[PDB]
Amino acid sequence: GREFGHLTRMRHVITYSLSPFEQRAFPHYFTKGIPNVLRRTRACILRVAPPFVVFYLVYTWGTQEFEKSKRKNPAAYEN
């Protein structure tokens, strides 16, 4: 079936690599990760957050409305 011998036809692509023992496992981990993490967060925040913000607003409103509904209504005891 699908085996490394025959998956696709590729030509004129050169890949240079390094031994794991010749390179650092965490090269520029913070100084490059933090800007990259910020970039990814900026890209994805406008797509992910708004639905959860709406959910939180709905949750707070529903909890407040339920708590108000459980509260006593003075107008029922005017007489």
């Binding site: 004129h12 050169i14 890949t15 240079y16 794991p20 496992a25």
Partner: protein, 238 residues
């Protein structure tokens, strides 16, 4: 409408905090001298006190202090025995119908899992025991009912069980209502979770081990994946 119990600063609410076994001993004294008359703890035996708050000889003395019905003898009729640490805490009533008859149709719940069976746990139990109050204007309680704002429905069939000097502690601690309530709630928390201290210790050990391992396995993964993450690929068409 219902009232939620406050979050009291229990000495075991810490992330790695254990129980006060002195409080456990005092709470057991409270249990055997106050609530044992009507409440039961079926799933707690005297042998469970050996490594918690009483030494083995003290646990044996506690067990021998209460008679227990034993199996049939040669004649074939049940008899009574001084009791041993293999026995469980005695049932105040034989069957739940007897308990209901003796408590105006209300069944005193079993206290082995009470802190684990009620929302709020020991907080709810402590607020209930010390929360008895005179019913507000407009509340009409049936005969044999007492107003406790924390009990659902605010009409509980349990008369206030604890008060100042209800029992005299062996440890010598002043027997204020709050002290008795705190000690009995700590004991009930132990009863619900007899593995509390061991669970906390194992949690500390596993936190240390995970803090040791996760960076190490992460470093191993980075070491393996460095080949691909540094890989430079070039395209050289003719």
């Amino acid at each position: 409408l219902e009232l939620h119990a406050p979050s009291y600063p229990w000495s075991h609410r810490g992330l790695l905090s254990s129980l006060d076994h002195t409080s456990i001993r005092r709470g057991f004294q409270v249990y055997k001298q106050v609530c044992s008359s009507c409440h039961s703890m079926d799933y707690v035996a005297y042998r469970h006190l050996v490594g918690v708050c009483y030494t083995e000889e003290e646990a044996k003395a506690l067990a021998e202090e209460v008679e227990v019905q034993d199996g049939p003898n040669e004649d074939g009729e049940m008899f009574m025995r001084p009791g041993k640490l293999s026995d469980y805490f005695p049932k105040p009533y034989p069957n739940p119908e007897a308990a209901r008859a003796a408590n105006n149709g209300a069944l005193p719940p079993d206290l082995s899992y009470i802190v684990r069976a009620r929302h709020g746990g020991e907080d709810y139990v402590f607020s209930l025991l010390t929360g008895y109050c005179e019913p507000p204007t407009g509340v009409s309680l049936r005969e044999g009912l007492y107003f406790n704002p924390y009990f659902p429905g605010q009409a509980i069939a349990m008369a206030p069980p604890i008060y100042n000097e209800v029992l005299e502690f062996d440890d010598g601690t002043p027997a204020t209502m709050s002290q008795v309530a705190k000690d009995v709630c700590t004991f009930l928390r132990w009863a619900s979770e007899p593995e509390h201290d061991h669970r906390k210790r194992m949690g500390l050990k596993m936190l240390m081990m995970m803090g040791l391992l996760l960076p190490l396995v992460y470093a191993m993964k980075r070491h393996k994946w460095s080949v691909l993450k540094s890989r430079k690929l070039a395209y050289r068409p003719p």
